[PDB]
Symmetry: C3
Subunit: 208 residues, 3 copies
């Protein structure tokens, strides 16, 4: 088995010309991670073993600076353009004035075995916990998805957290999530994780 | 690290002679997927990065035509024959008149990070959602397991769906699951997913 | 993509000198598994495709004899020493009189897609079920975490089980978990799994 783990996407009815990932020179992509297609990876990002970032259906997939995509995390997205050239707007997320299938902001941690599936956006300085799930949702900035929480079809307001195990599928429930406060157990977590993963990215780059 | 990702299973007390996978020429197995042992993969199937199909304990594992095994999905199964040559019938699923450890039907989608663990059967045209789980169960045809749902020890009747996050462990609960209807949010999903993944399989085969 | 899947950890502010894994000659590490850093793997252990054992943040990570780390399982841990040389004792687990970030005991099964994230300890002869999660917890010996259960911030007493889907986050709830008894469905499971995986480790070693 001989292959390149950083690859162009395939030609399909919705993808006339292949794109290959645009990765900042200071990002570290593990040899056992997979990054395919129309992807932009920012500076000082670490992509760990067994992650799969695949921008071949819905595109583009963006990962902002100093973010981390941990072991086994999957990024993928629903088709953004149909077989007619029509952009399927329900499957497209808008962040600032740019369109994405999946937008991962800056300083965001996607912890081990989580998944963010487009259409989706994750705001700056948010922690997506281990085994958590985000799909058809916009997670605000400075949020915390504790381990095994999920956001499906909702907008999670800035500065809120989703308790471990909780699956949020209605906007009514998302609106009443609890707020991150100083004494909250995950209140400083993301900053510490980002500091660690920026340092891991540089250490691993020095072995590459 | 030099290896073949499509491999025979190992000799064990329950597996006197190794078998290697039987894969249709039109299926695409990603270089970073793993397919081991007594496996049959049908036409136009796509197996994505980080999937692991391992037919070394319970066997055989079958994946029908135009189905997809998405990133990080695991197929494995409990031992089907003991150290005595006796077939452990509780761990064997019957589909038509053929015996399998895991049977994935035709046009079935196993979405990212899901797992189907034998004994198990998944009927045609069913969607197994992201991070969902099927074990010791028979999922009927035209079903939908929404993201993070699970079927354990049960038979899910044809045309029903399991709401996101719901873990179904009793036949009484499986019998009362809701039915897929036209206005249900996942009612056309599988057909669209299968169309996309058949096209991805061909596009990726043209890069191989 | 050319790489070694068994690697030293990177130099960081908390890791002045790299360590490479210490793996018993009778253990089998799949070519598509990843094992990085200050890790000790015992005899007759099987590490399956797509597992990631990464001892680069919190360390060391230990896996005892005749245990198994199944497909897609992730072991990782919170930082154990800060940028000051101070050992962060809350993130360190004590087992006997030795300190670990993650301690997996002997005869323990980490089933497919589970994760044990340090600080954490898992006692001998315990089964951690498919897609289950252990973090900031001490799981006793002879326990069973059924599929999709989770232990977060708690001590699970010896001989207890966590029902499928249940997320246990309080010591009050952990104290009242049910006990494994002869008639419990998973009462003999781990011993059978360990017997199978010890045999798989040897079979796979004979293909290596
Ligand atoms: Co997808
Ligand atoms: Co198994
Ligand atoms: Co971690």
């Amino acid at each position: 088995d001989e292959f390149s783990n950083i690859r162009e996407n395939p030609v399909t009815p919705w993808n006339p010309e292949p794109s290959a990932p645009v990765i900042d020179p200071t990002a570290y992509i593990d040899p056992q991670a997979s990054v395919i297609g129309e992807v932009t990876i920012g500076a000082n990002v670490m992509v760990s073993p067994m992650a799969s970032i695949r921008s071949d259906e819905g595109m583009p997939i963006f990962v902002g600076d100093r973010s981390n995509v941990q072991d086994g995390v999957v990024l993928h997205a629903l088709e953004t353009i149909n077989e007619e050239g029509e952009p399927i707007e329900d499957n497209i997320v808008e962040v600032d004035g740019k369109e994405y299938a999946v937008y991962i902001g800056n300083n965001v941690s996607l912890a081990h075995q989580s998944q963010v599936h487009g259409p989706a956006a994750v705001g700056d300085d948010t922690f997506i916990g281990m085994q958590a799930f985000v799909f058809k949702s916009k997670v605000g900035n400075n949020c915390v998805l504790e381990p095994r929480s999920a956001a499906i079809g909702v907008t999670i307001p800035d500065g809120r957290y989703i308790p471990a195990g909780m699956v949020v599928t209605s906007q009514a429930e998302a609106d009443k999530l609890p707020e991150v406060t100083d004494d909250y157990a995950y209140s400083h977590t993301n900053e510490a994780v980002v500091y660690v993963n920026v340092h891991l990215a540089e250490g691993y780059k020095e072995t590459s």
